[PDB]
Amino acid sequence: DFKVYLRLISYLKPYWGVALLVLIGFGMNSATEVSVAKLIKFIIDAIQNASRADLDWFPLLIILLVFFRGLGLFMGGYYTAVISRSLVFSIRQEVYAKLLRLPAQYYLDNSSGHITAKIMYNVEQLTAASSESLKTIVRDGMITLGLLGYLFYTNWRLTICIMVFLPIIGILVRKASKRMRKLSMQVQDTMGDVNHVVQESINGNAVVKSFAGEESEQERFYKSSEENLKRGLKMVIVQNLNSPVVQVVMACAMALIVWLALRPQILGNTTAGEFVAYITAAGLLSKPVKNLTDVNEKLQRGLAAAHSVFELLDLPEEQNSGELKPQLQGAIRFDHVVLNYADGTQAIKDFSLDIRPGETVALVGRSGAGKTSLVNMLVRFQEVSSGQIYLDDLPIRDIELSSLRTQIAMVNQQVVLFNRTVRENIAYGQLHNASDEDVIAAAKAAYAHDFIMNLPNGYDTVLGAQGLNLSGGQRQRIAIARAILKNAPILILDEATSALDNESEHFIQQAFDEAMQDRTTIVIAHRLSTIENADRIVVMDRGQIVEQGTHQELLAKHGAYYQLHQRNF
Amino acid sequence: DFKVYLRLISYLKPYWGVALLVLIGFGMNSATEVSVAKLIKFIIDAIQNASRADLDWFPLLIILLVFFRGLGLFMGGYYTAVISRSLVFSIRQEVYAKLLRLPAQYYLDNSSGHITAKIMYNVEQLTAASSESLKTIVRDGMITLGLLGYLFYTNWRLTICIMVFLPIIGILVRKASKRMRKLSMQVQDTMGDVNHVVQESINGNAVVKSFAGEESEQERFYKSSEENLKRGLKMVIVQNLNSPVVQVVMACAMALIVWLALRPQILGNTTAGEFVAYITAAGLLSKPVKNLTDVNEKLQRGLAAAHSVFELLDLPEEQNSGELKPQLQGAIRFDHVVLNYADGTQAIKDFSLDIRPGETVALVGRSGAGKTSLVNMLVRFQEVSSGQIYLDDLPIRDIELSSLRTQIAMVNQQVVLFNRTVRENIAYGQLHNASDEDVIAAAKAAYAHDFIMNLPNGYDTVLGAQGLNLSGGQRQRIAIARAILKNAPILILDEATSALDNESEHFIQQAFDEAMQDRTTIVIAHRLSTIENADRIVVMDRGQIVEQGTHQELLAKHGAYYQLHQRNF
């Protein structure tokens, strides 16, 4: 249950000092609460003939006592909230780390990002308040320790009898209060049904324009509602009176005290001010358990999210089973990709794709039918359930994770605009290891240098409030620049959604065509010249590679295939 | 300010007994609270050599004391909530009465019905809780009375000095707490801006797919957030420590007590257990004022609605300046109606309508341009600002209000379906003075007797949960039956929106045509035969009667006017 909590505690074993300070503060608060009744006993001592010496300090005694209590409570709350915030931060850091290198089905299947982040935050605050109630529980436990200690110091057997008669009636009162609250809710609903019915039947101006005689009808409806209301009010008063049962319990406790007094042993003891202190502390003890009852309540309230939180933290890990290959030449062949939407049947089955080394080829076919799914598969969102995905004269997994990440690129609607510096957005990977001359060269290559860079700070243009200084076309141009500037060995992008409706379409297309040289990539281009300039093409049908052959024959056919590819039906 | 409150109090002067019981209960609760410290003083008396007699009863003393306190508190809360509910009911009754015979601009101009009803209910609950806090204030005031009484009984001059040193530091603490809360809110917002900014910047899975290096970025953002959080936490701890200022105030009070003790006069007095009781009560007094502070808070919170509530209660009354005329023959002539949408210019200006006695005539023209406004004017939603509206050889106002209400009728979208018995819905006015034979005759005249009455209980068919057993067409037929069954001298309805798309259109139209006989009414009928069978017609243009003449000429023209009237452009 508390595995992740124990993990965080082990981490904050580095904050062992903080934890010890927090415990010291809570214990100091409890000791101050005990000293309250303690010094209270000293008050009566002043009233015993000659006691005048302590009388003056008694004022200063209570003053400095309150001062020390405030100091301890302040320090405890401070360090406690500090520890809580530190735990929130560490939990968030681990949560992000898990979110990094996460699985596709996180966002692909569920609303992982926003919803799960808000759940993480809600659970963070919840577990924080849970640790806080735990600290309050520690305070109450130290308070009970002090009560038992004073009890042992005063009269061991009497305290034993007191504990015997105690707690049981308290739990009985807790159960009685729960039942009373349930009955109050039931009666309140019984009255509130009629209450809402009456409060929802006031329309009908035309009816008044006709007759307007329903005054007695409203009187009668309100009369029945008022009968139910009297019932509920009496129930609420009974709920208030229920605490007198706990009063009767404390009265039986006082009766036990009176019986101890009936034993002459107490008389010879003559507890007196000590007895006053004992009763006072017993009362002080009541606040501790009273607060402590809510501890489990809010504890469950928070665990309701914390369980799923730790589960997602320990959710299915993306097993990075991979070799360490620095770079390859371009000999990539994925064979027999048999997969479809997860938790379903097989639709893109045996989606084999074998490509000659070095050369760049393109594929065309139906716009939909899982084309984006095929792209994600290329992005290794899934794996070829069949065949042999041999890359760089070795398996697909037989490669470094970084190199695959380094070659990772795409030019589609999947654009990640980071609200940061234009230079920051220019270098997606290893920005701190990028030269400024290369940055200026890329800005020249941006195909929107006179427009996109036409903003404050130029090359250092920090994206404003959600890109308040950026437009859609300029944002698209900037994203294209950021992608193109990357010198990846193979920046294969599924660009079937390429359109010329954006600004600087000619310049952007020319820059893309220039960058396409010396870059092995499989993109469904939208330029007619680029389409006619392709090297190798395969006729993909039903969302999978169904046919292939020379691209010249397909280009020169100009029939149904060309019409479907161009006009998109 | 409290005029309506005083009015309700004058009404509940009939509940003077209830009020006296409530005051008695609150005073009993305060007396019990005083007796707490009182008997507490008696406790020490047991510890004074031979006191054994009271020792046994002391248990029973505390027990029966708690019992009496619970009894009094229960009775007070009970009768208090009873009075609150009674006040809610009376206020609601008066509110409905005002809502009855209300002005047009209530619903016509504003969302009076639902919104104002919910406002009335919110204000009702608010003023109820306000009276409740007032009762708590009465409890606190009686408690202060008891404190001052015990103070006078113990030591008048000492109590004077105590009151002198008191209250001032309490108000200072109140102001300090308000300022501390404001500072806490400011610091919490200062931290929470960055908190929300961080909690809203976690997206970007594609960025991770590319580089995934922002771990240190998150660490730094969280570091700044944590700095702000440490600031806010220290502020909250300071807020907690602020109560030690009030502790220091009570410490100065204890210092005053100690100085009184430094006067030997207290020593000769030797308050002892009495001093213990005095300090205890002073503490008990703290809870009273502590609760009382919120009284003004919630008082204003409720008055925020109560002021507008009493205003709408005393809002512009519909001055029923009218004579007492039982019935008329049908000689109605409204002249020079110069009015338009309220708080605006004049559009339907000089909308005169003079009709011969007895005969029934119809008017046609543009569908819109304030036709419904003209209908409402006929419904006396407004008045002819010019001309002489002479009815029954006397002014329009020179007639009984009931007779106008009796003649009030309409067959349009303004249908008031009352979720009640079919017989109840049949007789809109004076249902309890309607014969069952006439009810059966009307049900036969319903034109949907085989369909509308084809439900449970037949003639006693109570409309279910929002008419769960009724359909739209059956509901329209039932409404038509309810309207037609009324034997009003003139049931003039603006039926320009008449359509034949409903079920039993032929039967309903035949019944309407039959009922049209021997009934003076101005309706823009949709039946071609009814249109051709009209007696007198007037050509109304631009939403007002612009032309007139023989209806035969207009019917035989069959030109632009007929096309506009029929096809509705």
GROMACS .gro file of N, CA and C in nm, chain B residues 38-107:
model
  210
  607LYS      N    1  -1.896   2.800   3.762
  607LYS     CA    2  -1.948   2.806   3.898
  607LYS      C    3  -1.920   2.677   3.974
  608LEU      N    4  -1.974   2.566   3.923
  608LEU     CA    5  -1.953   2.435   3.984
  608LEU      C    6  -1.805   2.399   3.985
  609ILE      N    7  -1.731   2.445   3.884
  609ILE     CA    8  -1.587   2.422   3.882
  609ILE      C    9  -1.524   2.480   4.008
  610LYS      N   10  -1.570   2.597   4.050
  610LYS     CA   11  -1.524   2.654   4.176
  610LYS      C   12  -1.558   2.561   4.293
  611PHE      N   13  -1.675   2.498   4.287
  611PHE     CA   14  -1.717   2.409   4.395
  611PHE      C   15  -1.626   2.287   4.405
  612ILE      N   16  -1.559   2.252   4.294
  612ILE     CA   17  -1.474   2.133   4.293
  612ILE      C   18  -1.364   2.146   4.397
  613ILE      N   19  -1.299   2.262   4.401
  613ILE     CA   20  -1.189   2.282   4.495
  613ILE      C   21  -1.239   2.275   4.639
  614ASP      N   22  -1.365   2.312   4.660
  614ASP     CA   23  -1.425   2.310   4.793
  614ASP      C   24  -1.417   2.170   4.852
  615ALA      N   25  -1.435   2.069   4.767
  615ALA     CA   26  -1.417   1.932   4.812
  615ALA      C   27  -1.281   1.913   4.876
  616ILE      N   28  -1.177   1.973   4.818
  616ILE     CA   29  -1.046   1.968   4.880
  616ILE      C   30  -1.037   2.085   4.976
  617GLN      N   31  -1.101   2.071   5.092
  617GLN     CA   32  -1.082   2.157   5.207
  617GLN      C   33  -1.125   2.079   5.330
  618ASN      N   34  -1.028   2.021   5.401
  618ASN     CA   35  -1.051   1.919   5.503
  618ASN      C   36  -1.183   1.844   5.485
  619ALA      N   37  -1.274   1.859   5.582
  619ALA     CA   38  -1.403   1.791   5.576
  619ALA      C   39  -1.497   1.859   5.478
  620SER      N   40  -1.520   1.797   5.363
  620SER     CA   41  -1.616   1.846   5.266
  620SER      C   42  -1.693   1.730   5.205
  621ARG      N   43  -1.668   1.610   5.258
  621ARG     CA   44  -1.706   1.483   5.197
  621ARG      C   45  -1.850   1.479   5.145
  622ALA      N   46  -1.939   1.556   5.205
  622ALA     CA   47  -2.080   1.552   5.167
  622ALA      C   48  -2.099   1.584   5.020
  623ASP      N   49  -2.037   1.693   4.973
  623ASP     CA   50  -2.054   1.733   4.834
  623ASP      C   51  -1.972   1.647   4.738
  624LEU      N   52  -1.876   1.569   4.789
  624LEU     CA   53  -1.786   1.496   4.701
  624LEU      C   54  -1.861   1.395   4.615
  625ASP      N   55  -1.953   1.320   4.676
  625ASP     CA   56  -2.030   1.221   4.602
  625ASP      C   57  -2.119   1.286   4.497
  626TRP      N   58  -2.192   1.390   4.538
  626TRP     CA   59  -2.285   1.455   4.446
  626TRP      C   60  -2.211   1.522   4.331
  627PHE      N   61  -2.085   1.562   4.354
  627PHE     CA   62  -2.005   1.631   4.253
  627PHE      C   63  -2.010   1.555   4.121
  628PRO      N   64  -1.990   1.423   4.123
  628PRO     CA   65  -2.012   1.344   4.002
  628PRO      C   66  -2.151   1.367   3.945
  629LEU      N   67  -2.253   1.341   4.028
  629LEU     CA   68  -2.390   1.363   3.984
  629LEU      C   69  -2.412   1.509   3.950
  630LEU      N   70  -2.341   1.599   4.017
  630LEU     CA   71  -2.353   1.741   3.987
  630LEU      C   72  -2.313   1.769   3.843
  631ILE      N   73  -2.193   1.725   3.805
  631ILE     CA   74  -2.145   1.747   3.669
  631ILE      C   75  -2.235   1.676   3.569
  632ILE      N   76  -2.282   1.557   3.605
  632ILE     CA   77  -2.367   1.479   3.515
  632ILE      C   78  -2.496   1.553   3.486
  633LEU      N   79  -2.572   1.585   3.591
  633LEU     CA   80  -2.698   1.654   3.573
  633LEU      C   81  -2.678   1.793   3.513
  634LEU      N   82  -2.564   1.856   3.540
  634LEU     CA   83  -2.535   1.985   3.478
  634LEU      C   84  -2.523   1.971   3.327
  635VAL      N   85  -2.444   1.873   3.282
  635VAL     CA   86  -2.432   1.848   3.139
  635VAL      C   87  -2.568   1.814   3.081
  636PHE      N   88  -2.648   1.737   3.156
  636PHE     CA   89  -2.781   1.701   3.109
  636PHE      C   90  -2.867   1.824   3.088
  637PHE      N   91  -2.870   1.913   3.187
  637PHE     CA   92  -2.950   2.034   3.175
  637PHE      C   93  -2.900   2.123   3.062
  638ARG      N   94  -2.768   2.133   3.047
  638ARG     CA   95  -2.712   2.213   2.939
  638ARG      C   96  -2.755   2.159   2.804
  639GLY      N   97  -2.746   2.027   2.787
  639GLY     CA   98  -2.791   1.966   2.663
  639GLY      C   99  -2.939   1.990   2.639
  640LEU      N  100  -3.020   1.976   2.744
  640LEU     CA  101  -3.164   1.998   2.730
  640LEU      C  102  -3.192   2.140   2.682
  641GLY      N  103  -3.132   2.238   2.748
  641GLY     CA  104  -3.154   2.377   2.710
  641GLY      C  105  -3.105   2.407   2.570
  642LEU      N  106  -2.985   2.360   2.536
  642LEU     CA  107  -2.932   2.384   2.402
  642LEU      C  108  -3.020   2.320   2.297
  643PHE      N  109  -3.067   2.198   2.323
  643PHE     CA  110  -3.155   2.130   2.229
  643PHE      C  111  -3.283   2.208   2.208
  644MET      N  112  -3.347   2.249   2.318
  644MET     CA  113  -3.473   2.322   2.306
  644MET      C  114  -3.452   2.454   2.232
  645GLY      N  115  -3.343   2.524   2.263
  645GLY     CA  116  -3.317   2.651   2.198
  645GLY      C  117  -3.294   2.635   2.049
  646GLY      N  118  -3.206   2.543   2.011
  646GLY     CA  119  -3.183   2.519   1.870
  646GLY      C  120  -3.310   2.477   1.799
  647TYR      N  121  -3.390   2.391   1.864
  647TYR     CA  122  -3.513   2.343   1.804
  647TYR      C  123  -3.609   2.458   1.775
  648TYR      N  124  -3.648   2.531   1.880
  648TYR     CA  125  -3.744   2.639   1.860
  648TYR      C  126  -3.687   2.746   1.768
  649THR      N  127  -3.555   2.768   1.772
  649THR     CA  128  -3.494   2.868   1.686
  649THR      C  129  -3.507   2.829   1.540
  650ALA      N  130  -3.471   2.705   1.506
  650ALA     CA  131  -3.486   2.660   1.369
  650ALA      C  132  -3.632   2.657   1.329
  651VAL      N  133  -3.721   2.628   1.424
  651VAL     CA  134  -3.864   2.632   1.396
  651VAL      C  135  -3.905   2.772   1.355
  652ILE      N  136  -3.860   2.872   1.431
  652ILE     CA  137  -3.891   3.010   1.399
  652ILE      C  138  -3.831   3.048   1.265
  653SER      N  139  -3.710   3.000   1.237
  653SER     CA  140  -3.646   3.029   1.110
  653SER      C  141  -3.728   2.974   0.994
  654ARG      N  142  -3.771   2.848   1.005
  654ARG     CA  143  -3.852   2.789   0.900
  654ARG      C  144  -3.984   2.863   0.886
  655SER      N  145  -4.045   2.902   0.997
  655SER     CA  146  -4.170   2.977   0.990
  655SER      C  147  -4.149   3.109   0.919
  656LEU      N  148  -4.038   3.176   0.948
  656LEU     CA  149  -4.006   3.301   0.880
  656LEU      C  150  -3.985   3.278   0.731
  657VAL      N  151  -3.915   3.170   0.696
  657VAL     CA  152  -3.896   3.137   0.556
  657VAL      C  153  -4.030   3.119   0.488
  658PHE      N  154  -4.121   3.046   0.553
  658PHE     CA  155  -4.252   3.020   0.495
  658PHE      C  156  -4.331   3.149   0.476
  659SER      N  157  -4.334   3.234   0.579
  659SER     CA  158  -4.409   3.359   0.569
  659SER      C  159  -4.351   3.450   0.463
  660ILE      N  160  -4.218   3.461   0.459
  660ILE     CA  161  -4.153   3.541   0.357
  660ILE      C  162  -4.186   3.487   0.219
  661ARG      N  163  -4.184   3.355   0.203
  661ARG     CA  164  -4.217   3.296   0.075
  661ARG      C  165  -4.362   3.326   0.037
  662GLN      N  166  -4.453   3.321   0.134
  662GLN     CA  167  -4.593   3.348   0.106
  662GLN      C  168  -4.612   3.491   0.059
  663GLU      N  169  -4.551   3.586   0.130
  663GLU     CA  170  -4.560   3.725   0.087
  663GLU      C  171  -4.494   3.745  -0.048
  664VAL      N  172  -4.384   3.675  -0.073
  664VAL     CA  173  -4.313   3.687  -0.200
  664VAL      C  174  -4.400   3.639  -0.314
  665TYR      N  175  -4.468   3.526  -0.294
  665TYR     CA  176  -4.561   3.477  -0.394
  665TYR      C  177  -4.674   3.575  -0.416
  666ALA      N  178  -4.730   3.629  -0.307
  666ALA     CA  179  -4.838   3.726  -0.319
  666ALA      C  180  -4.795   3.844  -0.405
  667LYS      N  181  -4.674   3.895  -0.381
  667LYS     CA  182  -4.622   4.002  -0.466
  667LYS      C  183  -4.602   3.953  -0.609
  668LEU      N  184  -4.552   3.831  -0.624
  668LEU     CA  185  -4.536   3.774  -0.757
  668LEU      C  186  -4.670   3.762  -0.828
  669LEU      N  187  -4.774   3.728  -0.753
  669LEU     CA  188  -4.908   3.739  -0.807
  669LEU      C  189  -4.940   3.885  -0.837
  670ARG      N  190  -5.009   3.908  -0.949
  670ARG     CA  191  -5.045   4.042  -0.994
  670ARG      C  192  -4.921   4.130  -1.012
  671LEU      N  193  -4.814   4.071  -1.065
  671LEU     CA  194  -4.689   4.143  -1.084
  671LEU      C  195  -4.690   4.219  -1.216
  672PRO      N  196  -4.583   4.291  -1.248
  672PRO     CA  197  -4.578   4.367  -1.373
  672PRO      C  198  -4.517   4.287  -1.488
  673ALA      N  199  -4.546   4.334  -1.609
  673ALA     CA  200  -4.497   4.267  -1.729
  673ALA      C  201  -4.345   4.266  -1.733
  674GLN      N  202  -4.283   4.380  -1.702
  674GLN     CA  203  -4.138   4.392  -1.716
  674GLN      C  204  -4.062   4.296  -1.626
  675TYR      N  205  -4.130   4.228  -1.534
  675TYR     CA  206  -4.064   4.126  -1.454
  675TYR      C  207  -4.003   4.019  -1.545
  676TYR      N  208  -4.087   3.947  -1.618
  676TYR     CA  209  -4.040   3.844  -1.709
  676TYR      C  210  -4.008   3.900  -1.847
   0.00000   0.00000   0.00000
